[PDB]
Design a protein around this nucleic acid. Structure first.
Lengths: 67, 81, 67, 302, 67
RNA sequence: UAAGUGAUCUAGAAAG
Protein backbone atom coordinates (compact mmCIF):
# COMPACT_ATOMS: atom_id res chain seq x y z
CA UNK A 1 0.00 0.00 0.00
CA UNK A 2 2.61 2.55 -1.16
CA UNK A 3 0.49 4.49 -3.59
CA UNK A 4 -2.68 5.80 -1.94
CA UNK A 5 -6.07 5.39 -3.62
CA UNK A 6 -6.09 8.97 -4.92
CA UNK A 7 -3.47 8.40 -7.62
CA UNK A 8 -5.48 7.72 -10.77
CA UNK A 9 -3.81 6.01 -13.76
CA UNK A 10 -2.70 2.72 -12.13
CA UNK A 11 -5.97 1.96 -10.26
CA UNK A 12 -7.06 -1.15 -12.25
CA UNK A 13 -10.00 0.91 -13.55
CA UNK A 14 -10.55 2.13 -17.10
CA UNK A 15 -9.99 5.85 -17.92
CA UNK A 16 -13.66 6.39 -18.77
CA UNK A 17 -14.47 4.32 -15.69
CA UNK A 18 -12.12 6.50 -13.67
CA UNK A 19 -13.85 9.61 -14.99
CA UNK A 20 -17.24 8.16 -14.08
CA UNK A 21 -16.03 7.36 -10.57
CA UNK A 22 -14.69 10.90 -10.18
CA UNK A 23 -18.06 12.29 -11.23
CA UNK A 24 -19.82 10.01 -8.75
CA UNK A 25 -17.47 11.14 -5.98
CA UNK A 26 -18.18 14.77 -6.82
CA UNK A 27 -21.92 14.18 -6.67
CA UNK A 28 -21.77 12.09 -3.51
CA UNK A 29 -20.01 14.84 -1.52
CA UNK A 30 -22.28 15.90 1.34
CA UNK A 31 -24.41 18.89 0.23
CA UNK A 32 -21.97 19.90 -2.52
CA UNK A 33 -24.42 21.61 -4.88
CA UNK A 34 -25.88 24.04 -2.33
CA UNK A 35 -25.51 27.72 -3.25
CA UNK A 36 -27.67 28.90 -0.32
CA UNK A 37 -25.26 29.65 2.53
CA UNK A 38 -22.59 31.12 0.19
CA UNK A 39 -21.34 27.63 -0.65
CA UNK A 40 -18.80 27.85 -3.50
CA UNK A 41 -17.09 24.90 -5.21
CA UNK A 42 -13.94 25.14 -7.35
CA UNK A 43 -12.37 22.42 -9.45
CA UNK A 44 -8.69 22.86 -10.29
CA UNK A 45 -7.26 21.00 -13.24
CA UNK A 46 -3.55 21.54 -13.79
CA UNK A 47 -0.60 19.79 -15.33
CA UNK A 48 2.60 19.22 -13.38
CA UNK A 49 4.79 20.58 -16.18
CA UNK A 50 8.02 18.63 -16.71
CA UNK A 51 7.28 16.50 -13.63
CA UNK A 52 9.67 13.76 -14.77
CA UNK A 53 11.85 16.09 -16.85
CA UNK A 54 13.37 17.83 -13.80
CA UNK A 55 13.75 15.02 -11.25
CA UNK A 56 17.29 15.27 -9.82
CA UNK A 57 18.88 11.87 -9.36
CA UNK A 58 20.51 12.78 -6.04
CA UNK A 59 17.22 13.70 -4.40
CA UNK A 60 15.42 10.93 -6.26
CA UNK A 61 18.00 8.40 -5.07
CA UNK A 62 17.60 9.44 -1.45
CA UNK A 63 13.81 9.36 -1.79
CA UNK A 64 13.91 5.82 -3.17
CA UNK A 65 16.27 4.76 -0.39
CA UNK A 66 13.26 5.54 1.87
CA UNK A 67 10.89 3.21 0.04
CA UNK B 1 24.99 -19.70 -40.44
CA UNK B 2 22.88 -16.58 -39.71
CA UNK B 3 22.49 -15.65 -36.00
CA UNK B 4 22.18 -12.95 -33.28
CA UNK B 5 25.31 -10.80 -32.75
CA UNK B 6 27.37 -10.37 -29.55
CA UNK B 7 30.33 -12.29 -28.06
CA UNK B 8 33.75 -10.94 -26.99
CA UNK B 9 36.27 -8.53 -28.54
CA UNK B 10 39.21 -10.50 -29.97
CA UNK B 11 42.28 -8.28 -30.34
CA UNK B 12 42.39 -8.71 -34.12
CA UNK B 13 38.73 -7.69 -34.27
CA UNK B 14 39.46 -4.63 -32.13
CA UNK B 15 42.32 -3.68 -34.45
CA UNK B 16 40.04 -4.05 -37.47
CA UNK B 17 37.46 -1.82 -35.81
CA UNK B 18 40.12 0.79 -35.09
CA UNK B 19 41.18 0.71 -38.74
CA UNK B 20 37.56 1.15 -39.82
CA UNK B 21 37.17 4.11 -37.47
CA UNK B 22 40.27 5.71 -38.99
CA UNK B 23 38.77 5.12 -42.42
CA UNK B 24 35.05 5.97 -42.01
CA UNK B 25 35.05 8.04 -38.83
CA UNK B 26 33.09 7.95 -35.61
CA UNK B 27 29.56 8.33 -37.11
CA UNK B 28 29.00 5.62 -39.70
CA UNK B 29 28.69 2.76 -37.29
CA UNK B 30 26.72 0.57 -39.68
CA UNK B 31 29.59 0.32 -42.16
CA UNK B 32 32.14 -0.50 -39.47
CA UNK B 33 29.76 -3.13 -38.07
CA UNK B 34 29.43 -4.64 -41.54
CA UNK B 35 33.22 -4.83 -41.76
CA UNK B 36 33.08 -7.06 -38.58
CA UNK B 37 31.20 -10.32 -39.37
CA UNK B 38 30.54 -11.03 -35.64
CA UNK B 39 29.82 -7.67 -34.00
CA UNK B 40 26.90 -5.26 -34.30
CA UNK B 41 26.83 -1.53 -35.09
CA UNK B 42 25.71 -0.58 -31.59
CA UNK B 43 28.21 -2.98 -30.05
CA UNK B 44 30.99 -1.50 -32.18
CA UNK B 45 30.16 2.12 -31.40
CA UNK B 46 29.90 1.32 -27.69
CA UNK B 47 33.28 -0.41 -27.76
CA UNK B 48 34.86 2.55 -29.52
CA UNK B 49 33.32 4.96 -27.01
CA UNK B 50 34.23 2.87 -23.98
CA UNK B 51 37.49 1.01 -24.53
CA UNK B 52 39.03 1.59 -27.93
CA UNK B 53 39.09 5.41 -28.43
CA UNK B 54 42.62 6.79 -27.79
CA UNK B 55 41.42 10.13 -26.33
CA UNK B 56 40.31 8.18 -23.24
CA UNK B 57 42.77 7.24 -20.47
CA UNK B 58 43.36 4.17 -18.29
CA UNK B 59 46.22 5.56 -16.16
CA UNK B 60 45.75 5.17 -12.40
CA UNK B 61 44.32 8.03 -10.36
CA UNK B 62 46.50 10.19 -8.09
CA UNK B 63 45.57 10.56 -4.40
CA UNK B 64 43.99 13.93 -5.22
CA UNK B 65 42.12 12.25 -8.08
CA UNK B 66 41.00 9.45 -5.76
CA UNK B 67 39.68 12.06 -3.35
CA UNK B 68 37.84 13.80 -6.18
CA UNK B 69 36.30 10.49 -7.25
CA UNK B 70 35.12 9.26 -3.85
CA UNK B 71 33.97 12.79 -3.01
CA UNK B 72 31.89 12.72 -6.20
CA UNK B 73 30.43 9.36 -5.17
CA UNK B 74 29.55 10.83 -1.78
CA UNK B 75 27.89 13.81 -3.45
CA UNK B 76 26.58 12.41 -6.80
CA UNK B 77 25.23 8.98 -5.81
CA UNK B 78 25.91 6.39 -8.54
CA UNK B 79 25.31 8.60 -11.55
CA UNK B 80 28.46 7.11 -12.93
CA UNK B 81 28.30 8.60 -16.44
CA UNK C 1 17.43 24.06 -9.67
CA UNK C 2 16.41 22.65 -6.26
CA UNK C 3 17.46 24.73 -3.27
CA UNK C 4 18.98 22.38 -0.67
CA UNK C 5 16.55 23.75 1.93
CA UNK C 6 13.70 22.78 -0.39
CA UNK C 7 15.16 19.29 -0.79
CA UNK C 8 15.45 18.95 2.98
CA UNK C 9 11.82 20.02 3.39
CA UNK C 10 10.74 17.46 0.80
CA UNK C 11 12.68 14.75 2.61
CA UNK C 12 11.05 15.73 5.91
CA UNK C 13 7.61 15.55 4.29
CA UNK C 14 8.12 12.13 2.72
CA UNK C 15 9.66 10.76 5.92
CA UNK C 16 6.69 12.07 7.89
CA UNK C 17 4.33 10.38 5.44
CA UNK C 18 5.85 6.91 5.61
CA UNK C 19 6.21 7.34 9.38
CA UNK C 20 2.45 7.87 9.56
CA UNK C 21 1.89 4.77 7.34
CA UNK C 22 4.16 2.21 9.06
CA UNK C 23 5.24 1.49 5.48
CA UNK C 24 7.83 -1.29 5.54
CA UNK C 25 10.20 -0.80 2.58
CA UNK C 26 10.55 -3.18 -0.37
CA UNK C 27 13.54 -5.50 0.14
CA UNK C 28 16.15 -6.41 -2.42
CA UNK C 29 14.52 -9.54 -3.89
CA UNK C 30 16.20 -12.76 -2.60
CA UNK C 31 15.66 -16.41 -3.66
CA UNK C 32 12.73 -16.63 -1.17
CA UNK C 33 9.75 -15.87 -3.44
CA UNK C 34 6.95 -18.19 -4.48
CA UNK C 35 5.96 -15.36 -6.84
CA UNK C 36 9.44 -14.86 -8.38
CA UNK C 37 8.77 -17.07 -11.39
CA UNK C 38 5.27 -15.62 -11.77
CA UNK C 39 6.69 -12.09 -11.67
CA UNK C 40 9.24 -13.00 -14.33
CA UNK C 41 6.49 -14.45 -16.52
CA UNK C 42 4.66 -11.13 -16.44
CA UNK C 43 7.62 -9.05 -17.63
CA UNK C 44 8.42 -11.53 -20.39
CA UNK C 45 4.79 -11.52 -21.51
CA UNK C 46 4.80 -7.72 -21.61
CA UNK C 47 7.98 -7.74 -23.68
CA UNK C 48 6.55 -10.42 -25.97
CA UNK C 49 3.52 -8.20 -26.58
CA UNK C 50 5.79 -5.89 -28.63
CA UNK C 51 6.96 -8.79 -30.85
CA UNK C 52 3.87 -10.97 -31.48
CA UNK C 53 2.48 -8.62 -34.17
CA UNK C 54 5.55 -7.52 -36.19
CA UNK C 55 6.97 -10.68 -37.82
CA UNK C 56 9.96 -8.98 -39.51
CA UNK C 57 12.31 -7.91 -36.70
CA UNK C 58 15.48 -5.81 -36.30
CA UNK C 59 18.80 -7.14 -34.94
CA UNK C 60 18.24 -5.63 -31.50
CA UNK C 61 14.67 -6.95 -31.54
CA UNK C 62 15.93 -10.40 -32.51
CA UNK C 63 18.44 -10.33 -29.65
CA UNK C 64 15.70 -9.35 -27.21
CA UNK C 65 13.51 -12.19 -28.45
CA UNK C 66 16.38 -14.64 -28.03
CA UNK C 67 16.95 -13.41 -24.48
CA UNK D 1 -20.04 -66.62 -19.37
CA UNK D 2 -19.72 -63.57 -21.66
CA UNK D 3 -16.46 -64.80 -23.15
CA UNK D 4 -15.27 -67.80 -25.21
CA UNK D 5 -14.43 -71.28 -23.86
CA UNK D 6 -10.93 -70.73 -25.28
CA UNK D 7 -10.59 -67.46 -23.29
CA UNK D 8 -11.60 -69.34 -20.12
CA UNK D 9 -9.15 -72.24 -20.75
CA UNK D 10 -6.13 -70.21 -21.99
CA UNK D 11 -6.37 -66.44 -21.37
CA UNK D 12 -7.62 -66.18 -17.77
CA UNK D 13 -4.87 -66.57 -15.12
CA UNK D 14 -5.36 -69.58 -12.75
CA UNK D 15 -5.29 -67.66 -9.47
CA UNK D 16 -5.01 -63.99 -8.35
CA UNK D 17 -3.71 -63.87 -7.14
CA UNK D 18 -2.34 -64.66 -3.55
CA UNK D 19 -2.58 -61.66 -1.28
CA UNK D 20 1.25 -61.15 -1.04
CA UNK D 21 1.48 -60.02 -4.71
CA UNK D 22 -1.29 -57.44 -4.08
CA UNK D 23 0.12 -55.58 -1.05
CA UNK D 24 2.46 -52.92 0.18
CA UNK D 25 4.96 -54.76 2.39
CA UNK D 26 5.61 -52.10 5.12
CA UNK D 27 3.92 -54.11 7.92
CA UNK D 28 5.25 -57.43 6.47
CA UNK D 29 8.91 -56.31 6.58
CA UNK D 30 8.61 -55.00 10.15
CA UNK D 31 7.09 -58.37 11.15
CA UNK D 32 9.87 -60.31 9.33
CA UNK D 33 12.56 -58.15 11.02
CA UNK D 34 10.99 -58.67 14.49
CA UNK D 35 10.87 -62.41 13.73
CA UNK D 36 14.67 -62.26 13.12
CA UNK D 37 14.69 -62.60 9.33
CA UNK D 38 17.81 -60.77 8.09
CA UNK D 39 17.62 -61.91 4.44
CA UNK D 40 14.15 -60.86 3.26
CA UNK D 41 14.93 -61.56 -0.44
CA UNK D 42 15.49 -65.27 0.30
CA UNK D 43 12.58 -65.76 2.67
CA UNK D 44 10.87 -68.97 1.41
CA UNK D 45 7.50 -67.58 0.33
CA UNK D 46 5.29 -69.96 -1.67
CA UNK D 47 4.87 -67.13 -4.17
CA UNK D 48 7.58 -64.42 -3.69
CA UNK D 49 6.56 -60.74 -4.05
CA UNK D 50 8.41 -58.48 -6.54
CA UNK D 51 11.79 -57.52 -4.98
CA UNK D 52 11.16 -53.77 -5.60
CA UNK D 53 8.06 -53.83 -3.30
CA UNK D 54 10.26 -55.25 -0.52
CA UNK D 55 13.03 -52.66 -1.19
CA UNK D 56 10.61 -49.66 -1.15
CA UNK D 57 9.10 -50.86 2.13
CA UNK D 58 12.63 -51.25 3.69
CA UNK D 59 13.33 -47.62 2.61
CA UNK D 60 10.06 -46.34 4.19
CA UNK D 61 10.80 -48.13 7.49
CA UNK D 62 14.30 -46.56 7.54
CA UNK D 63 12.70 -43.08 7.02
CA UNK D 64 10.20 -43.78 9.85
CA UNK D 65 13.26 -44.71 12.02
CA UNK D 66 11.95 -48.25 12.71
CA UNK D 67 14.99 -49.75 11.03
CA UNK D 68 18.55 -48.39 10.71
CA UNK D 69 20.38 -48.10 7.34
CA UNK D 70 21.96 -51.54 7.84
CA UNK D 71 18.39 -52.94 8.10
CA UNK D 72 18.30 -53.67 11.83
CA UNK D 73 15.54 -52.83 14.31
CA UNK D 74 15.85 -49.65 16.37
CA UNK D 75 14.29 -49.17 19.83
CA UNK D 76 11.41 -47.50 17.97
CA UNK D 77 11.07 -50.50 15.57
CA UNK D 78 10.96 -52.91 18.51
CA UNK D 79 8.33 -50.78 20.30
CA UNK D 80 6.36 -50.34 17.02
CA UNK D 81 6.23 -54.11 16.52
CA UNK D 82 4.39 -54.44 19.89
CA UNK D 83 1.40 -52.52 18.44
CA UNK D 84 -1.02 -54.33 16.05
CA UNK D 85 -1.05 -51.40 13.69
CA UNK D 86 -0.13 -49.43 10.17
CA UNK D 87 3.30 -47.96 11.27
CA UNK D 88 2.42 -44.31 10.34
CA UNK D 89 -0.76 -44.41 12.43
CA UNK D 90 0.96 -46.25 15.32
CA UNK D 91 3.88 -43.75 15.37
CA UNK D 92 1.49 -40.72 15.25
CA UNK D 93 -0.44 -42.28 18.12
CA UNK D 94 2.55 -43.19 20.37
CA UNK D 95 4.09 -39.70 20.10
CA UNK D 96 0.80 -37.88 20.66
CA UNK D 97 1.33 -37.31 24.40
CA UNK D 98 4.54 -35.30 23.66
CA UNK D 99 2.30 -32.90 21.69
CA UNK D 100 -0.34 -32.67 24.50
CA UNK D 101 -3.26 -34.06 22.40
CA UNK D 102 -3.24 -37.84 22.90
CA UNK D 103 -7.02 -38.01 23.58
CA UNK D 104 -7.79 -36.23 20.26
CA UNK D 105 -5.24 -38.32 18.32
CA UNK D 106 -6.67 -41.58 19.86
CA UNK D 107 -10.04 -40.40 18.33
CA UNK D 108 -8.52 -39.46 14.92
CA UNK D 109 -6.70 -42.79 14.68
CA UNK D 110 -9.85 -44.79 15.53
CA UNK D 111 -11.77 -42.88 12.83
CA UNK D 112 -8.98 -43.54 10.26
CA UNK D 113 -9.30 -47.30 11.08
CA UNK D 114 -12.90 -47.37 9.76
CA UNK D 115 -14.52 -46.47 6.42
CA UNK D 116 -15.74 -42.95 5.45
CA UNK D 117 -18.63 -42.28 7.87
CA UNK D 118 -20.36 -39.65 5.71
CA UNK D 119 -23.28 -40.88 3.61
CA UNK D 120 -23.75 -39.05 0.29
CA UNK D 121 -26.65 -40.35 -1.86
CA UNK D 122 -26.39 -39.56 -5.60
CA UNK D 123 -29.78 -37.76 -5.73
CA UNK D 124 -29.44 -36.13 -2.27
CA UNK D 125 -25.98 -34.53 -2.44
CA UNK D 126 -26.91 -30.99 -1.28
CA UNK D 127 -28.64 -32.14 1.96
CA UNK D 128 -25.80 -34.61 2.68
CA UNK D 129 -23.05 -32.02 1.99
CA UNK D 130 -24.87 -29.50 4.28
CA UNK D 131 -24.98 -32.06 7.15
CA UNK D 132 -21.26 -32.86 6.66
CA UNK D 133 -20.56 -29.09 6.86
CA UNK D 134 -21.88 -29.17 10.46
CA UNK D 135 -18.71 -31.10 11.38
CA UNK D 136 -16.30 -29.99 8.67
CA UNK D 137 -13.11 -28.28 9.79
CA UNK D 138 -11.80 -26.16 6.82
CA UNK D 139 -8.27 -27.20 5.68
CA UNK D 140 -8.53 -30.09 8.17
CA UNK D 141 -10.25 -33.36 7.16
CA UNK D 142 -8.52 -35.12 10.13
CA UNK D 143 -10.13 -32.54 12.48
CA UNK D 144 -13.50 -33.26 10.72
CA UNK D 145 -13.06 -36.90 11.89
CA UNK D 146 -12.49 -35.70 15.49
CA UNK D 147 -15.60 -33.46 15.35
CA UNK D 148 -17.99 -36.24 14.10
CA UNK D 149 -16.84 -38.75 16.71
CA UNK D 150 -17.17 -36.12 19.49
CA UNK D 151 -20.73 -35.32 18.33
CA UNK D 152 -21.60 -39.02 18.02
CA UNK D 153 -20.61 -39.52 21.70
CA UNK D 154 -22.42 -36.37 22.87
CA UNK D 155 -25.30 -36.45 25.42
CA UNK D 156 -27.39 -34.68 22.71
CA UNK D 157 -27.35 -38.01 20.74
CA UNK D 158 -30.66 -39.72 19.83
CA UNK D 159 -31.69 -43.09 18.30
CA UNK D 160 -31.82 -42.05 14.62
CA UNK D 161 -29.36 -39.10 14.89
CA UNK D 162 -26.93 -40.82 12.49
CA UNK D 163 -29.61 -41.18 9.79
CA UNK D 164 -30.73 -37.51 10.16
CA UNK D 165 -27.13 -36.25 9.83
CA UNK D 166 -26.10 -38.66 6.97
CA UNK D 167 -23.72 -40.67 9.13
CA UNK D 168 -23.02 -44.40 8.98
CA UNK D 169 -23.79 -45.73 12.51
CA UNK D 170 -22.00 -49.07 11.82
CA UNK D 171 -18.70 -47.30 11.05
CA UNK D 172 -18.96 -44.84 14.00
CA UNK D 173 -19.86 -47.75 16.33
CA UNK D 174 -16.82 -49.68 15.04
CA UNK D 175 -14.62 -46.58 15.60
CA UNK D 176 -15.85 -46.42 19.24
CA UNK D 177 -14.97 -50.06 19.91
CA UNK D 178 -11.57 -49.48 18.19
CA UNK D 179 -11.05 -46.33 20.35
CA UNK D 180 -11.78 -48.28 23.56
CA UNK D 181 -9.46 -51.16 22.54
CA UNK D 182 -6.73 -48.67 21.53
CA UNK D 183 -7.15 -46.79 24.91
CA UNK D 184 -6.73 -50.09 26.79
CA UNK D 185 -3.38 -50.62 24.99
CA UNK D 186 -2.31 -46.98 25.91
CA UNK D 187 -2.98 -47.81 29.57
CA UNK D 188 -1.15 -51.18 29.32
CA UNK D 189 2.01 -49.68 27.70
CA UNK D 190 2.07 -46.49 29.86
CA UNK D 191 1.18 -43.91 27.21
CA UNK D 192 0.52 -41.46 28.47
CA UNK D 193 -3.02 -40.35 27.54
CA UNK D 194 -3.30 -36.54 27.43
CA UNK D 195 -5.04 -33.67 25.70
CA UNK D 196 -4.85 -29.89 25.44
CA UNK D 197 -7.46 -27.23 26.30
CA UNK D 198 -7.47 -25.89 22.71
CA UNK D 199 -4.93 -26.71 19.98
CA UNK D 200 -5.28 -27.83 16.33
CA UNK D 201 -1.53 -27.16 15.68
CA UNK D 202 -0.52 -30.06 17.94
CA UNK D 203 -2.97 -32.49 16.18
CA UNK D 204 -1.55 -31.41 12.81
CA UNK D 205 2.05 -31.84 14.07
CA UNK D 206 1.26 -35.35 15.36
CA UNK D 207 -0.37 -36.29 12.04
CA UNK D 208 2.73 -34.93 10.18
CA UNK D 209 4.88 -37.02 12.49
CA UNK D 210 3.53 -40.24 10.99
CA UNK D 211 2.53 -39.07 7.51
CA UNK D 212 5.31 -36.64 6.46
CA UNK D 213 6.07 -38.74 3.34
CA UNK D 214 2.39 -38.48 2.23
CA UNK D 215 2.56 -34.76 1.67
CA UNK D 216 1.63 -32.63 -1.29
CA UNK D 217 1.97 -28.99 -2.20
CA UNK D 218 -0.33 -26.71 -4.18
CA UNK D 219 1.08 -25.84 -7.62
CA UNK D 220 -0.33 -23.81 -10.57
CA UNK D 221 0.02 -26.48 -13.28
CA UNK D 222 -0.67 -29.77 -11.53
CA UNK D 223 -3.16 -28.65 -8.87
CA UNK D 224 -1.03 -30.38 -6.27
CA UNK D 225 2.35 -32.09 -6.42
CA UNK D 226 3.30 -34.97 -4.06
CA UNK D 227 6.55 -34.72 -2.01
CA UNK D 228 7.28 -38.43 -2.61
CA UNK D 229 7.89 -39.09 -6.37
CA UNK D 230 6.65 -35.70 -7.62
CA UNK D 231 3.21 -36.91 -8.76
CA UNK D 232 0.62 -34.54 -10.26
CA UNK D 233 -2.55 -35.02 -8.16
CA UNK D 234 -5.93 -33.37 -7.64
CA UNK D 235 -7.79 -33.07 -4.36
CA UNK D 236 -10.31 -35.90 -4.38
CA UNK D 237 -13.86 -34.47 -4.83
CA UNK D 238 -14.96 -35.14 -1.23
CA UNK D 239 -12.82 -32.17 -0.14
CA UNK D 240 -12.69 -28.50 -1.22
CA UNK D 241 -9.91 -26.48 0.36
CA UNK D 242 -10.10 -22.75 1.04
CA UNK D 243 -0.29 -24.56 0.24
CA UNK D 244 0.80 -27.76 1.94
CA UNK D 245 -1.38 -30.71 2.95
CA UNK D 246 -0.89 -34.23 4.28
CA UNK D 247 -3.06 -36.92 2.72
CA UNK D 248 -4.17 -40.32 4.00
CA UNK D 249 -4.87 -41.88 0.63
CA UNK D 250 -3.74 -41.82 -3.01
CA UNK D 251 -6.68 -42.69 -5.24
CA UNK D 252 -5.99 -44.05 -8.71
CA UNK D 253 -8.80 -43.87 -11.31
CA UNK D 254 -8.38 -42.26 -14.79
CA UNK D 255 -6.72 -39.41 -12.90
CA UNK D 256 -4.68 -39.36 -9.70
CA UNK D 257 -6.27 -37.86 -6.59
CA UNK D 258 -5.42 -37.51 -2.94
CA UNK D 259 -8.19 -38.16 -0.40
CA UNK D 260 -8.61 -37.28 3.30
CA UNK D 261 -6.48 -34.13 3.47
CA UNK D 262 -5.37 -31.82 6.35
CA UNK D 263 -3.41 -28.52 5.80
CA UNK D 264 0.03 -28.31 7.50
CA UNK D 265 2.59 -25.53 7.98
CA UNK D 266 5.73 -26.60 6.00
CA UNK D 267 8.06 -25.27 8.72
CA UNK D 268 6.62 -28.08 10.88
CA UNK D 269 7.57 -30.58 8.09
CA UNK D 270 11.21 -29.37 8.31
CA UNK D 271 11.15 -29.41 12.15
CA UNK D 272 9.50 -32.86 12.57
CA UNK D 273 11.20 -34.75 9.70
CA UNK D 274 14.51 -32.93 8.86
CA UNK D 275 16.18 -36.06 7.43
CA UNK D 276 13.40 -36.48 4.80
CA UNK D 277 12.96 -32.74 4.06
CA UNK D 278 16.70 -32.47 3.41
CA UNK D 279 16.95 -30.41 0.19
CA UNK D 280 19.73 -32.74 -1.15
CA UNK D 281 17.18 -35.56 -1.47
CA UNK D 282 15.17 -33.47 -3.93
CA UNK D 283 16.47 -33.90 -7.48
CA UNK D 284 17.21 -30.78 -9.55
CA UNK D 285 14.91 -27.92 -8.53
CA UNK D 286 11.29 -28.58 -9.48
CA UNK D 287 8.35 -26.67 -7.87
CA UNK D 288 8.53 -28.46 -4.52
CA UNK D 289 12.31 -28.19 -4.21
CA UNK D 290 12.04 -24.62 -5.24
CA UNK D 291 9.32 -23.81 -2.70
CA UNK D 292 11.20 -25.68 0.14
CA UNK D 293 14.33 -23.46 -0.60
CA UNK D 294 12.50 -20.06 0.22
CA UNK D 295 10.95 -21.69 3.28
CA UNK D 296 14.35 -22.71 4.66
CA UNK D 297 15.93 -19.36 3.64
CA UNK D 298 13.42 -16.45 3.57
CA UNK D 299 10.79 -17.84 5.98
CA UNK D 300 13.02 -19.59 8.60
CA UNK D 301 16.71 -18.60 8.89
CA UNK D 302 16.16 -14.84 8.62
CA UNK E 1 -25.43 21.07 -37.61
CA UNK E 2 -27.25 23.60 -35.43
CA UNK E 3 -27.18 27.38 -35.84
CA UNK E 4 -23.41 28.03 -35.67
CA UNK E 5 -23.68 31.67 -34.49
CA UNK E 6 -26.20 30.86 -31.71
CA UNK E 7 -24.64 27.50 -30.80
CA UNK E 8 -21.44 29.34 -29.82
CA UNK E 9 -23.43 31.29 -27.18
CA UNK E 10 -25.70 28.57 -25.78
CA UNK E 11 -26.27 24.89 -26.36
CA UNK E 12 -29.17 24.46 -28.76
CA UNK E 13 -31.40 21.50 -29.22
CA UNK E 14 -30.14 20.01 -32.47
CA UNK E 15 -32.36 21.57 -35.14
CA UNK E 16 -30.83 21.00 -38.55
CA UNK E 17 -29.17 17.79 -39.67
CA UNK E 18 -26.44 18.05 -42.24
CA UNK E 19 -25.70 15.10 -44.54
CA UNK E 20 -22.38 13.58 -43.55
CA UNK E 21 -20.83 10.86 -45.67
CA UNK E 22 -23.37 10.73 -48.47
CA UNK E 23 -23.72 8.59 -51.59
CA UNK E 24 -25.86 8.14 -54.72
CA UNK E 25 -28.16 5.13 -54.23
CA UNK E 26 -28.03 5.67 -50.48
CA UNK E 27 -28.19 2.33 -48.69
CA UNK E 28 -28.39 3.16 -45.00
CA UNK E 29 -25.05 1.82 -43.79
CA UNK E 30 -25.31 1.31 -40.04
CA UNK E 31 -22.75 3.18 -37.94
CA UNK E 32 -20.43 1.60 -35.49
CA UNK E 33 -21.58 3.75 -32.54
CA UNK E 34 -24.93 1.89 -32.22
CA UNK E 35 -23.14 -1.45 -31.71
CA UNK E 36 -20.99 -0.40 -28.77
CA UNK E 37 -22.51 -0.30 -25.30
CA UNK E 38 -22.35 3.34 -24.25
CA UNK E 39 -20.34 3.83 -21.10
CA UNK E 40 -23.03 4.85 -18.62
CA UNK E 41 -25.08 1.78 -19.52
CA UNK E 42 -21.92 -0.31 -19.25
CA UNK E 43 -21.25 1.05 -15.76
CA UNK E 44 -24.72 0.77 -14.26
CA UNK E 45 -24.82 -2.70 -15.84
CA UNK E 46 -21.40 -3.45 -14.35
CA UNK E 47 -22.65 -2.45 -10.90
CA UNK E 48 -25.65 -4.75 -11.31
CA UNK E 49 -23.73 -7.79 -12.56
CA UNK E 50 -20.94 -7.40 -10.02
CA UNK E 51 -23.52 -7.08 -7.25
CA UNK E 52 -25.14 -10.27 -8.53
CA UNK E 53 -21.77 -12.02 -8.57
CA UNK E 54 -21.10 -10.91 -5.00
CA UNK E 55 -24.49 -12.21 -3.88
CA UNK E 56 -23.96 -15.56 -5.58
CA UNK E 57 -20.47 -15.82 -4.09
CA UNK E 58 -22.08 -15.47 -0.67
CA UNK E 59 -24.60 -18.14 -1.68
CA UNK E 60 -21.74 -20.42 -2.70
CA UNK E 61 -20.03 -19.84 0.64
CA UNK E 62 -23.23 -20.60 2.55
CA UNK E 63 -23.87 -23.71 0.41
CA UNK E 64 -20.12 -24.61 0.39
CA UNK E 65 -19.85 -25.06 -3.39
CA UNK E 66 -17.74 -23.89 -6.33
CA UNK E 67 -19.76 -21.15 -8.08
C1' U F 1 -55.14 24.82 -28.62
C1' A F 2 -51.95 19.71 -31.23
C1' A F 3 -47.12 16.84 -38.14
C1' G F 4 -44.40 15.85 -41.81
C1' U F 5 -42.57 22.03 -48.41
C1' G F 6 -37.85 22.81 -49.06
C1' A F 7 -31.04 23.50 -49.20
C1' U F 8 -27.65 17.05 -52.05
C1' C F 9 -19.40 18.23 -52.86
C1' U F 10 -17.03 15.08 -55.92
C1' A F 11 -16.08 12.98 -60.86
C1' G F 12 -9.54 11.91 -64.88
C1' A F 13 -4.93 11.83 -67.69
C1' A F 14 0.68 12.36 -67.92
C1' A F 15 4.85 11.92 -65.65
C1' G F 16 6.91 10.25 -61.38
Amino acid sequence: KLFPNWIKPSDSEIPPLLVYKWTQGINNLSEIWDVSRGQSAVLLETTLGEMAEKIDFTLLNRLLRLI
Amino acid sequence: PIYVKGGVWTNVEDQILKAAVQKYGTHQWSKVASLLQKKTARQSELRWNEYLNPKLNFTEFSKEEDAQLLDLARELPNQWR
Amino acid sequence: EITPEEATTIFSVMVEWLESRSFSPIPFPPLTYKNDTKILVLALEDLKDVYASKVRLNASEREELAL
Amino acid sequence: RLYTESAFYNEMLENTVPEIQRQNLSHTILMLKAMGINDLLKFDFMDPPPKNLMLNALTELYHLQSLDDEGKLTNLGKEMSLFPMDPTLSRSLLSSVDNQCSDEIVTIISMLSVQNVFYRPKDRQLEADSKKAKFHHPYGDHLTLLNVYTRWQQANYSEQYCKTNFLHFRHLKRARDVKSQISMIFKKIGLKLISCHSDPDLIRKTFVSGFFMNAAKRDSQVGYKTINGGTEVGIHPSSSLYEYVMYHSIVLTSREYMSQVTSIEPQWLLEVAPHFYKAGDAESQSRKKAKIIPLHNKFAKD
Amino acid sequence: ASDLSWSKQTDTGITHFRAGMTHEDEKLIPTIFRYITTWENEFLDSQRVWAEYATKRQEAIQQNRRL
